[model samples]
Target chain A: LNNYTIKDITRASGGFAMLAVDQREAMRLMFAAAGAKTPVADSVLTDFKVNAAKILSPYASAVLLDQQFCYRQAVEQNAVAKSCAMIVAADDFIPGNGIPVDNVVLDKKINAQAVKRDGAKALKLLVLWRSDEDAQQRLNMVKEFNELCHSNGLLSIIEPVVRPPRCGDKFDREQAIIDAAKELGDSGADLYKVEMPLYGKGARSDLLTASQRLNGHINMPWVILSSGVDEKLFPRAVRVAMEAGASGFLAGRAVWSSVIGLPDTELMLRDVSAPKLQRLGEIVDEMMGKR
Target chain B: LNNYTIKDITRASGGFAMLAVDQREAMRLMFAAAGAKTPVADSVLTDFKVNAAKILSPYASAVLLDQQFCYRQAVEQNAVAKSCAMIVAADDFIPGNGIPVDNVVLDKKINAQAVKRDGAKALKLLVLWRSDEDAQQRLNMVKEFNELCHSNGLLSIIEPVVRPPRCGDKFDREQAIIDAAKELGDSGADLYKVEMPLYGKGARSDLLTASQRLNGHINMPWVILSSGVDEKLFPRAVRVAMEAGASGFLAGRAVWSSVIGLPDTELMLRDVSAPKLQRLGEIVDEMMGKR
Candidate 1:
């Protein structure tokens, strides 16, 4: 029914080993935290994303990019490897109440068909799930995003990230992760992105069980993000999740977070980031070896 | 040198008999002035633009349209006749000081390549020429618009409408028209739209001579508009301008303004507007028969 499929952005083993350079202000904050210049210039962010795609896309099944920081710059230079699919983040954020990105909305400014002509295989949207927010809005936004992608011949990947309510209720982080999946797991996206359950930590058996429980909600093939999970634990998280019916991983921090603010962005991305990315791809293929 | 040319949107005699349904609030006000309705909804404006395009495009060489009124609606329904080239108004207005559109600025929001992909043959930019404003800004904006159009394989048409400066100086409509041509006659646009000299009034010799002086300022092919000229005198205006080396006209009012607010928009445009449009096209071709 869609112009693209998960296979278009997956490795030979039918598993995702995607790289995410789509982090906009978040990546700038990462640079600032690593002791680079404050309020990094947009070109520096753009150049870093471009360099990451140029150097690391060889090992990635796909490279995810955002319009604000990288998509045009990387695309103009043909930076991404020909073998790697291109994914554009099609979500616009609503920053509010002292939060950088308090909520997510479908970016109407995105010309979905235009991006498809730019060689993009997929469009990714971030969905914010909170108990206090209206469920219908979130549900409706995903359907629109899915239809936008499918109609434009691009795969739709919905990343449902759990957030605490704005004004009320005690926030249970783990429960919210499960609740997000239970709500949006079958919302018509070709792929679902789950926040690592229990932060991808604790005993392997517990992690595997939680991964299985989260997997139970999603009808589509799902992947785990490496946000809160420790980079050391992320490999095992991939193993445990795949053991419990998950696919591979669509990760960022674990792949190139260490390369931020490095002296030579190009040099470090090639040397330091490439190996980490290759290893993750190796783990994804190994875990999904049954394929 | 350009992807499209005057010939692409011209009669076999190399003249233009264009129809413009690009009017936005002004056309709505026309509806109000004719005592149709107050506070007209967007649907009315859109429907009228769509109907005009459907009924009148057949007699036109090209149809200029605005995104605000009915571009997508007209395009989706295939309302425009295939024989009529499509030209989109790619300028956004800066309404101020109790005016509907006080200023004209190059519209960056338009994805030129995207529109070119939409089967558009040209893009139209409205330039306000005034004494108290910045010349460099206007000059730069035109070059940008020209390059945007040429680079995207679409023709560029600049409509340099004369207006009084916001601040100082007495209004001189006629001199401003000539000065506008001298300043932007060679601004890289493929076609120049000149406001009719002396409102296209006066004797045959005076109108022809004033048009000749305006023509001397412009290097590229040019055409006349039908704003201030009376419909009875408009046919004469086109003849004199063509005698002074002008190709023909890109007009709207003379063709369909009479039918505004008439019951049965479709029927009126077909019966009432179509005859006027067909005659205007004939006048254009007859005057340009030398080609």
Candidate 2:
């Protein structure tokens, strides 16, 4: 492993409990939903990201950022803590028809080398998993991405998000979650980031069973994403995942969504978001003790 | 001349009218005077700068910034207008011993290449003029600084503000202004920035005569700085200076001082600060027409 990768991911205690605030279009959507004007000002987005980094990085192993918004600004401002490493998203989302499918593609502008040069410890790429298409193409993309990251001395984090095909009969998110892990499990990525099974809403025994089954398919360390899952249920979801052999989480909405529309953004980030991350960090530390 | 220098300084109509928001410690002092806590957060400085750029860049030829607070953040947010170029300050203040000498030194961290790489069209340096110090040292410093900027294809702007020695009996502010201009006026720099004669409070004809004398010393285009000058008198100062020979003005507090302590920074920037800059720009355009 590269020095940055080892230093960033090999945390002092349990496993990596990273924070992901790397949303670009996703952030615009959030602001729009929050009643901000269409095509929200760039300053607003940068303000949120920098504030998040400042308040949340102290509790995270690392904070994931996107190149489009606040990566350089955050670094320049010293917003992130020195203890928390930075990971930049290396993927670009290609929009599909009305419905959002994770038609993930590599960002042409920000390469692994540039991310590393900017002092990021790792690079993350999203891989869209669909049972209908040629799986080899996706596998090849993952392999190339992993090799590129390794060559640039950055850790390769592959986030394989499950999605229904454009022409599929119906979307079965639970089954697709397992299918995505099963396919991209041994793609040589340093870490596998998977969606929460049953959106973290099922019975405790069922959640543990699903977590173990998903764990069995992955050939590397893994973390759970918190997009589809509710924020209140995320800690319990993390507890079950860790009990079933998962490392930790790289999450965003679960920790910050509550403060999205608050009038006083900085104040809300300080009082509301900070405690959420601290509680989540404590949960991860407790899970570590059990292991 | 380099492309950035030409684009930023050589305005389409007349001379350059740039806005200077590059203050750090000085701004902190202003904030403190306005009842803000000591050592204001970096975000406060950055927020003020971004607001200034957004509101004022459309009216000026360029906006001067400091590397410490918001240069990268402003660029990332596209805070400045396409028509307005960026100039970065490249000097650090040297404290004096209970005396008011503008002792200054180059910032060792930000070099010509780095500022240019950060999209700054020009680099500005402050040279403290004191008859007591080694003239050769100051001369050589300016010569080396000009060469460094030229080699990096960036414009070099030299600011010569006169100050008395620590043991001096009295400070002759008028003679010191003229003396600083005479010594460093022909120092191979691309631009000259000088203090307003008699701090912009002298008789109209006297202002014109002193500006004419300072103009005689400068080999290249020159501009006026507005630190100590009253905002009410700055337009007349610019008018007399440009009438003599100065190309334009690079001013800060005259346009922004009124809004410094206000609770609503952005609103004040838009309402009070924007009109101040707009009026200043109008004066510059009118002066250009007369020329």
Candidate 3:
């Protein structure tokens, strides 16, 4: 198997290859070989879209008040306007707890104002979640929105915690997910987002096992949880999922929260300097080749 | 000038529209848009590649180490394989801060092996800097590598940290960055990655001013840094660079390194949750138009 770098995968997948080569050329080389033009980039684009929603939705478990403040401040300072389609619930997912999407509110007034100020092209609608169930709710909401509006309802589902694997003891958690997927699949969602099933002790083996179970049942595309301070396990999780048949990976705090209060150099020396990301790409490449 | 949410961006940029039309149809549209005529899933393929890279590239930093084993344990834990790249001493930027790329011997080996094992179709080489001047040496090494082999080079640069901008009586740091860019431009880089100015009190304003000045002279497709642990200023820095016409942002330790031992839920809650990443994305979207 030829080991690929992250950039190579990114280029091969869809991160920014079009910037280098026209999409047409990319398709020709990629799809012609397989006698089908179903480029993986399309699915990745969908998957990553789901990943983006899961990570960016304000409805998720935790909020970085400082980060939010900075975003607004920076936008104001730059005098660049953008639409704010979604709003976070003030009292949901208050750290150490889980909440579903129904509890959240859609402030159309603020969203409209944001749209007027920032313009439609700049607006993104996000739905955050506190737990796997919360994420499921958001996913269902997006599907309903799309069905009702007859327009693409783009959103992400961010869960704070990974669901523990089903050990027959916690059959409800597993069933809840299964039921949620059934609903979403039936509802016809643009995307389905959820956390990786790896939390608590023995998360590694648990996640490995869960991938097998979930992969067989879950029809909608999903992103795994890279929710921790130290991202040492992120690559491993990614590798496992790719090996076991996952769509893609989504990282949040593993790639952002660590950047809280250090020098930019130090930050780069630590975060951007991670080689594990590339390793993950290599593994994915192997997976792709094998398939 | 729409204030787009992350969701909007994802849907517009990704494959939801195509997927909605037909998963295969979506692939066709993306490939055509990407300028490909082949019947392959290039979009998904490329995205996976990039996501893989984004997931794995971190075993080489000082943040993960206990100052004893370097990346040996990390490498072993992941079972990363070795590669065939050489670490040449380049007089690129500065030299002898004792941060030698060669010092990451274990990491390099693992990265190389992982790439080989994972199937890297293209080369994504890491350009390490000894000092500010060493950037040229690094660039030259890349040139030589490209001449002899066929790998993509990611140019990394370092700048002089004269004084703290927030509290110190520093000559506006922008000059240093501009000077560094000028020097790096001379180095013939495919991608110029550089640092952000440090801040203290009024340091934010100074860095912004510096960013404006520095961005004008830097011509390469560049990635600006958020530097250190103070992500408080990340949005601002990103704004400054984007306004000043930077290509992207890069940070290492600031983005990861949240690896303190917390329960996975709390860890994802405090570190890798999607809400936090959305904040970061908000800044990027505010700057980059949500691509």
Candidate 2 similarity to native, TM-score: 0.49
RMSD of each: 26.2, 21.8, 20.2
> What local lDDT score does residue A278 receive in model 3, on the 0 to 100 scale?
35
Candidate 1 or 3, higher lDDT?
Answer: 1
Q: In model 3, which regions exceed 4 Å deviation?
A: A1-102, A110-140, A147-179, A200-206, A228-230, A263-291, B1-291
CAPRI grade of model 2: incorrect
- The deviation in Å at residue B180 for candidate 2 is 70
Q: Could you give the candidate ranking by DockQ, starting with the highest?
A: 3, 2, 1
TM-score: the better of candidates 1 and 3 = 1
- TM-score per prediction, in order, is 0.50, 0.49, 0.34
* Number of the top-ranking candidate, with lDDT as the measure: 1
Candidate 1 collision pairs: none
Measured on C-alpha atoms, candidate 1 has an lDDT of 0.84
Interface RMSD, Å, model 2 = 22.1
The runs of at least 3 residues in candidate 2 whose Cα sits more than 4 Å from the true structure, single-residue gaps closed, are: A1-7, A99-102, B1-291
What is the per-residue lDDT of model 2 for residues B1-291, given as tens digits with 9 covering 90 to 100? Answer: 454455456567667789999987778778878777766887888888889888888988888898789888888899989888888888877655743334777777876766677667888888888767788899998987887777888888998877776566677888888877778888888899889988877477888888898899888888999988876567678888999998889999988877776545665565456655766676677788897
